[model samples]
Target: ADPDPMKNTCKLLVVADHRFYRYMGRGEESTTTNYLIELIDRVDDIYRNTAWDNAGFKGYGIQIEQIRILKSPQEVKPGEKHYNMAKSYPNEEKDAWDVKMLLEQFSFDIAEEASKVCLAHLFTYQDFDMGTLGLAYVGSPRANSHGGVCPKAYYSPVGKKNIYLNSGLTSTKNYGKTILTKEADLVTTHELGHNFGAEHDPDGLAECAPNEDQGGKYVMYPIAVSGDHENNKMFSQCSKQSIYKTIESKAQECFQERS
Candidate 1:
């Protein structure tokens, strides 16, 4: 398995939609700010430290080099009532619209010109049918035929480097608020794993050897089947190897300098 980084550290760029902050209010310190602070920390802990640390890549880490909040779409206004669950587009169309919003509204060139990894967090009232928390590309079109296979796929022909996240599912709650406690972080990290070339472990025994101790909780297990956030954390050994192989293969170019 690939157990090292090409560079000493991998940089990250996080772009969030303004709606994520609107509900909490406008200020340097607010719900949005506090949530993001925790979000980044958790992500950093999982990807950079915990996930592969014991596997012999402890020092390799992902650093949040930049974080920015862009204005939300004009069609949807701020405030919970107007902002809450405002449907914008259908399934595939919604994905395209979300992607277009980030690529067009934000500076596509700004991301491509850089060599570091990038991630965009687009907070919407709802996406498709409100089941999706986030989406990202695994093996890019540039690397394989599977790229852009799904509407939510992050493979861009223009060679932009970033994973797209739709914060729709994170906005909802059910079962008496028993969900979304660590949902946002888990979903975000799961999608981020895709950016690194990980595929869904629909059945817990996909990539790694079966272990009775794992308790059937693995990172790549599709969220639909993963169920509780508390039951999951580290990626399976199989997922770890898949990610390593992905980074070592053509997928490596997915993070290459766009320009």
Candidate 2:
């Protein structure tokens, strides 16, 4: 029962850790903010152009609405919990379970801010000093739990959280190379895909993967789509279904949809 699926949108809260900001800016804050704005546009545009051919959802496109940004601890409201620079930042791993303990804690700290706004979904891109490009909590966005309370309840003053994301260009995969905008944005969308409940690509239902040249054909591929152009431009049928089902179920309760 979406009143109008075309107007469906995911209101996002974007948070970048100080290290992430510094890495992007190289000591200049403006560069990092501008690059973030650019990333928002590019990734949102990806959803805007993506079309769903699945029955009932056919011909619909997605909207990403970002209403807030927490680039640093100072940006959060006074007296609420904030990032502790002294604590050990989580080491994102291919094994998300290994990373979840700390990542979710940080996500809950960020959620203190979200408690005020109830942004539909939260995406935090941190600078992990490791090879792991990104990681997220799959299918975890929820407006409230008991008796329609605010989203603050899911996060402490916080497990069963929905937002855990990390991004970095300086890694074993592409070290000593100037960062590419499309590349970072691609990683962003892939992690966000997990938030939306789409498992890694090469799925059986849709079965889109393993192109002769591109091992990662779709955005949801377990690995990066090194050079898969056409497939990268669109989501596989399985991913489309996962996204649509997620929107229909979890996000609609809070994420402000656009017309």
Candidate 3:
């Protein structure tokens, strides 16, 4: 395989809210929530240090909160059958659809929350021109699957935002207790990268291509199967380019305030 190429400089406004831990499949007891927070930092480091020239993540920083996370109004209901039936896929399509709908609503809700947080805390105004991103936590829908669902299932007059994650891969026992937070944390965080326009490839393509394995170790790739892809925590070059493009075109102002 060939080495992954790089993109452009990108800046991101990562608003990490505190409402995803309240009513999900996972609770406060899933390992340590701090691990999740650390994972965010790790991703930043990856983007900054490695993907700056080649993959394009220009050392962007995230705005993370340190509060008890709540569940979005669009969280997956306790249980619902969501199968495609198209592939005998035996997958959760019905449940996924329902959750996707809920997520659209939650995106609206979070947009409000994020706006307020930005305005009050960061002194930033909310814009009606941009789209919104939404993520929710669902409990273990299946076993041994570190799954995340991105149902870009909504449209409006204003703009478009993708619902990037419904991560329930962490383990039932880790809910609320903070035991397996790493599992949920890594998957969800990586999915969030997707919402902000980061492709799994170092060049905006999917895995199994020239940028195979994001050049062998990338958090955007499927490097989580092993215990910890800490080495893969870096963002790919393409991701940074996309993020920078979003900011350059969409974001009118620069955000430097942290929460």
Candidate 3, TM-score vs. the true structure? 0.45
lDDT of 3 by residue, 1-259 (tens): 1222222222222322222343332435253345445555654454345443354434444444432233322223344221111111123332122334434333443433333221101101111111112233321112221112212223343325532232211221221243344444455445555544455554335542233333444555543423254334455555566544443322223234333
Q: Stretches of candidate 2 above 4 Å error?
A: 1-7, 53-98, 116-130, 140-152, 155-178, 203-206, 213-216, 257-259
For each candidate, what is the lDDT?
0.46, 0.50, 0.34
Best by TM-score: 2
- Tens digits of per-residue lDDT, candidate 2, 39-141, equal 7667677766665435454333233334334445344343343343423334324322123453555565555454543233333334334445666655533
Better of 1 and 2 by TM-score: 2
Q: Estimate the lDDT of model 1.
A: 0.46
Model 2 RMSD in angstroms:
6.4
lDDT of 1 by residue, 168-200 (tens): 113322232323646666776676677655787
Better model by lDDT, 2 or 3?
2
Instruction: Tell me the deviation in Å of residue 178 in model 1.
Output: 9.6
lDDT of 3: 0.34
Model 1 ranges off by over 4 Å: 1-8, 24-30, 50-55, 75-87, 91-117, 123-130, 139-179, 204-214, 225-231, 248-259
